[PDB]
Design a protein around this ligand. Sequence first.
Ligand code: HEM
Ligand code: HEM
Ligand SMILES: Cc1cc(N)nc(C[C@H]2CNC[C@@H]2NCCNCCc2cccc(F)c2)c1
Ligand SMILES: Cc1cc(N)nc(C[C@H]2CNC[C@@H]2NCCNCCc2cccc(F)c2)c1
Ligand SMILES: C[C@H](O)[C@H](O)[C@H]1CNc2nc(N)[nH]c(=O)c2N1
Ligand SMILES: C[C@H](O)[C@H](O)[C@H]1CNc2nc(N)[nH]c(=O)c2N1
Ligand SMILES: [Zn+2]
Lengths: 407, 411
Amino acid sequence: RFLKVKNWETDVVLTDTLHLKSTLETGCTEHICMGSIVLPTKDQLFPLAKEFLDQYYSSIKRFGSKAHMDRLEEVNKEIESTSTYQLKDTELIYGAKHAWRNASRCVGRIQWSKLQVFDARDCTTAHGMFNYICNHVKYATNKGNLRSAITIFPQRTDGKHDFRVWNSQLIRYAGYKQPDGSTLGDPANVQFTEICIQQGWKAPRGRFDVLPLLLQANGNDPELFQIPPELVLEVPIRHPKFDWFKDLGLKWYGLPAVSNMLLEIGGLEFSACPFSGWYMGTEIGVRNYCDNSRYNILEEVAKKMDLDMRKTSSLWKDQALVEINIAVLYSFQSDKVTIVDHHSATESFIKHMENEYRCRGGCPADWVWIVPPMSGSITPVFHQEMLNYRLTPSFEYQPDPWNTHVW
Amino acid sequence: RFLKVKNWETDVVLTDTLHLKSTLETGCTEHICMGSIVLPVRTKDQLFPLAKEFLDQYYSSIKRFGSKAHMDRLEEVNKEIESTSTYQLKDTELIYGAKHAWRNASRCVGRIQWSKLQVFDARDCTTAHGMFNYICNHVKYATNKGNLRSAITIFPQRTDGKHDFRVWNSQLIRYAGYKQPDGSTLGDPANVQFTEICIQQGWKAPRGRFDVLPLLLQANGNDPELFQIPPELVLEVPIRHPKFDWFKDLGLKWYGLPAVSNMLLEIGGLEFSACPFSGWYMGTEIGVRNYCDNSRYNILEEVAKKMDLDMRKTSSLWKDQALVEINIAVLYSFQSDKVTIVDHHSATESFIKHMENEYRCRGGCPADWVWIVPPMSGSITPVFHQEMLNYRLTPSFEYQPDPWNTHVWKG
Ligand code: HEM
Ligand code: HEM
Ligand SMILES: Cc1cc(N)nc(C[C@H]2CNC[C@@H]2NCCNCCc2cccc(F)c2)c1
Ligand SMILES: Cc1cc(N)nc(C[C@H]2CNC[C@@H]2NCCNCCc2cccc(F)c2)c1
Ligand SMILES: C[C@H](O)[C@H](O)[C@H]1CNc2nc(N)[nH]c(=O)c2N1
Ligand SMILES: C[C@H](O)[C@H](O)[C@H]1CNc2nc(N)[nH]c(=O)c2N1
Ligand SMILES: [Zn+2]
């Protein structure tokens, strides 16, 4: 019932009580662990609503008060009649901050309480969506001093009337399939990039082409829009000691802003809810640049360092990997754009976990995702046992709209 | 029910039916994943089911399932249990047994070698001094003058749990650590307590930064006994760097043979509480964990100082830079001295190949991602990108409490 988690580096032990408030399923059984798997009505709505309002009135310290009881009935009476209900602004902010608090795969939650929430529930069209997105991008970019933000479009109704941002992020680079068999740009976005050319985008067909936004209002055909270029802050990638680095021609955008997720608060489903913070260095250095199936620039870099690529055991991939990541951190900082290195991100996440243990009774955390994809064991999160569980409100993945939407 | 795992780099999907043959619990529930928790005397009743299962396995694999010789062995194990409360494994069964304990070992990235294990049967051993002698032969044979060979040495199974063979050392070769009275620690900090025990049992400690520990051996439930391993048997590699000449002045070395001596080997219900096994090292085990963990030799700072890195801001990635050099030095030193070692790239690649094969030939490969992915350069090794299913098959290697914690002292 109570569970202890030990840090095997500091011997510090914490007791988890928060997992018993967990509702949804993990994918794991007594017989099988599924921790490394990337993805494992009116009758239904009212309990969900009640469970959420109960934690909301508790957090504001008015559990079981007349204000509590009255909102509880008001929501019940709106469900029986309208087959859905509306959140109050205050409940919406709480909902969203907490969906971030509960994101077990996010290393950056020490920040959770300072989320800026933009309520876009009065939006009705794709142009309106575009306007909200641009105000989001600009607010959160803040000339390089980035701020956490989420913009919340109207909730799902019959399911035929969904708002959706088809992009997986607001700002991403195009992917094109070429005559050779090679890929130009970002291979992760090839399918989406084709969906842009078939909606009518003029692709410049380079390596770092900022994709257009494809916006869906109230279930309608989606629509193309270019983000004003002046709003997409980008950093050219150079190295502090290696002068040749600049001619690789690398740049990355400043703003990571996830836009394909679904926000569930008290049974209500917000299918367009883009949110953004700022990068941990390794996300770009290790994953975007180095993954075999992304930009995969490791061979090129190691060749420019004049390292021995004859045998795997020179650790030349490892040597290059560090420099590539040195250069991302250096470039961002020298341009005064917010970024965090993996040592700092994880040290901070450990502070946060210790905070959540004494102040909430626990902290759901998915180790497989928290441990950075380089230098695992030299970060303190490597030695830290974590319990993974699913709390609500939450962010969830959702089918890609193009498989699903009807034209 | 069939379960699919995806490789997110190659988009290869594989199908696991083997998980269906799993009986032990994982520590996980529908409501909670404990995949990163380090650790989450039998009666006659329980024993025959386990015996039967195992012997069914054994005989399936030799293609003799349901043969006269299979039924006759079942009946014979049956009788032996009801009459003696335990049973003896045939030699061939034990070999098969120990090989599968490896093959089922889901935290081991080194299973591609699983069949080529050399089994030493020390089940006639009755005394500590007998145990020293079997262990010495293990080590010499396994060391092979640097051309390491995997091997395990199986001492007599548990009987009533009052007569256990234990190897008190966590590994056969390991360095003393000594808590000084100023809170500092000389040698290996992981081995402090056990070192103290050795000292209590009469070991006269040199007190250097790398003193090979003495074997502490328990036979047949008896109080355990000290023995120095012959130093000519302990292969060690001094650590240098191919380009940094100052590296050798750090005074580092490591032993060449990793030999785990604290696990329990379970086969068809029988428990072997002393079963040291050994392989060869993946470079990162020494380089990342043994030298660079804060709770071990902790040399990152000393190494960064000497490279004159920018140590004033963690954003220089001075730690990441120092770590790669140290790992380079470990691999270089081993290769140059002709002692077997594998780098993490080549090991993880081998393991992906094994895993794929195991799905085609066995219908599964239980693997634990938290353990399989190396503690440096995770995502540039192909395992990071591989979905894995973790489950418990028997035969298996299990953990067991440390003996100083359970052992009944006699004087
Ligand atoms: C402000 C600094 C932030 C940092 C450094 C950060 C970092 C990360 C990292 C490293 C991941 C792992 C995913 C990967 O590497 O592919 C992640 C996932 C995630 N982040 Fe955070 N994040 C930040 C802000 C936010 C905000 C503001 C939200 C929402 C309010 C958020 C929600 C999530 C969610 C839901 C996931 C899981 C994504 C998935 O399951 O695919 N993050 N984040
Ligand atoms: C020969 C080359 C081998 C290599 C490179 C290798 C590699 C590894 C590594 C890197 C680990 C993770 C342990 C850690 O990092 O703390 C491990 C664990 C393990 N290995 Fe292997 N191994 C090899 C051979 C063997 C042999 C001979 C056996 C047994 C007969 C074996 C069985 C195991 C088991 C049972 C574990 C689980 C350890 C634990 O849970 O603490 N492997 N191995
Ligand atoms: C808001 C925020 C800040 C920061 N720093 N970082 C983030 C994570 C995103 C950035 N960099 C990757 C990650 N993206 C989140 C979405 N993950 C895709 C995993 C995936 C792929 C395919 C199929 C699946 F089912 C799942 C968010
Ligand atoms: C046979 C073989 C070959 C290789 N290369 N490598 C190995 C693993 C050992 C060497 N490098 C470290 C590792 N360790 C052996 C297993 N014990 C640690 C697990 C553990 C720790 C604390 C509490 C627990 F409950 C469990 C075995
Ligand atoms: C197979 C495995 O689940 C998959 O590669 C995961 C591993 N850990 C990860 N961790 C983070 N932070 N991001 C990822 O995309 C992944 N991918
Ligand atoms: C808490 C966490 O599971 C623990 O520190 C584990 C993580 N993965 C590991 N993986 C290996 N190979 N060896 C280890 O000691 C550990 N430690
Ligand atoms: Zn699990």
